[PDB]
Design a protein around this ligand. Structure first.
Ligand SMILES: [Mg+2]
Lengths: 70, 29, 172
RNA sequence: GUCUCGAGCCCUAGACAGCCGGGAGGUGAGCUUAGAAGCAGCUACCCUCUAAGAAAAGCGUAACAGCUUACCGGCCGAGGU
């Protein structure tokens, strides 16, 4: 029912494309409050118990695209 | 005795106080 | 070295010279086990394969004799089963058992019937498209099963187009 | 083929092999692209659950799927490499 994480980052960032080279080329930007809201949405999709460890999985897609957290 | 076996035997004792042969070695303790 | 084999309750094995005869509820398998300085015996109800020598050549046979005895035990208890399925593409092949020999007719369109022979006691029974080779002596069964597949050997043409013939489906 | 000898490393906290079981999710990585979802190509190769499980090693598919391989567990029981 709930759409994927790859389609949830492009809504609260600005850009719709990735990059020619991941990690090295920094395109999009997120924040502290901009990650704890994407964690409020996914529950049957994630295997994590805590609300702390659930955040670590969203980041596991971001640094491999070109996103810097402030 | 490899290091990983000892770190595991002690980690099983951490969930007893609070492989099948690695459970047995944690039971006798 | 020495290897002691426990003979089951359904099984009874007797010795006469170098010959071993294994009797049970499925039949009687007689075999001749011979090799230098190896002696096989029956200690009442255990089979003992022992030799004073421990060289690799001797260890090869002590091992082979064990599997020849262990497999003779299964022969007299449960028995040996090899399953075969007849396959044909264009020609209506007929596989009928006639006497102490299994016969195949009209193979690839031939007027001449291809006939093999049943080795020993072995029972080859057909249930339409299937065939099941069964018996106590694995030596006779595995060979009678082979003889059937091998009877449809075609070396003259490409086997990838001409795939007709009985094949082995189930190996025990 | 077989015999004798030495050396390093693994092993009853159960090795080697074999057979069984498991082989998970975020997630079809992203870009490339109508498409590529372990496995065309470029670059990265990151973290959850757990006893394990690769940004996938080998095959396989137009692509999925399927089969395994790393990796964990069980059976077994003695030396193994
Ligand atoms: Mg020709």
């Amino acid at each position: 029912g709930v759409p994927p994480t790859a389609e949830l980052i492009k809504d609260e960032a600005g850009f719709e494309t990735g990059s020619g080279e991941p990690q090295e080329d920094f395109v999009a930007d997120l924040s502290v409050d901009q990650v704890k809201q994407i964690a409020e949405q996914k529950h049957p999709d994630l295997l994590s118990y805590d609300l702390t460890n659930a955040a670590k999985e969203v980041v596991g897609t971001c640094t491999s695209l070109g996103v810097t957290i402030e | 005795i490899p290091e990983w076996k000892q770190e595991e035997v002690d980690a099983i004792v951490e969930m007893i106080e609070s492989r099948n042969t690695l459970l047995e070695r944690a039971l006798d303790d | 070295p020495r290897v002691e084999l426990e003979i089951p309750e359904d099984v009874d094995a007797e010795q006469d010279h170098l010959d071993i005869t294994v009797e049970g509820d499925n039949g009687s398998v007689t075999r001749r086990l011979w090799y230098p300085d190896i002696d096989v015996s029956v200690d009442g109800d255990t089979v003992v394969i022992e030799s004073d020598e421990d060289n690799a050549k001797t260890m090869s046979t002590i091992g082979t004799f064990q599997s020849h005895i262990e497999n003779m035990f299964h022969g007299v208890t449960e028995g040996w089963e090899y399953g075969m399925e007849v396959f044909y593409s264009h020609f209506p092949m007929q596989v009928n058992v006639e006497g102490d020999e299994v016969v195949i007719e009209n193979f690839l369109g031939e007027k001449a019937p291809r006939r093999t022979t049943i080795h020993g006691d072995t029972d080859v029974e057909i249930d339409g498209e299937e065939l099941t080779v069964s018996g106590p002596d694995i030596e006779a069964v595995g060979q009678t099963a082979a003889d059937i597949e091998q009877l449809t050997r075609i070396n003259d043409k490409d086997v990838r187009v001409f795939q007709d013939g009985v094949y082995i489906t189930r190996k025990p």
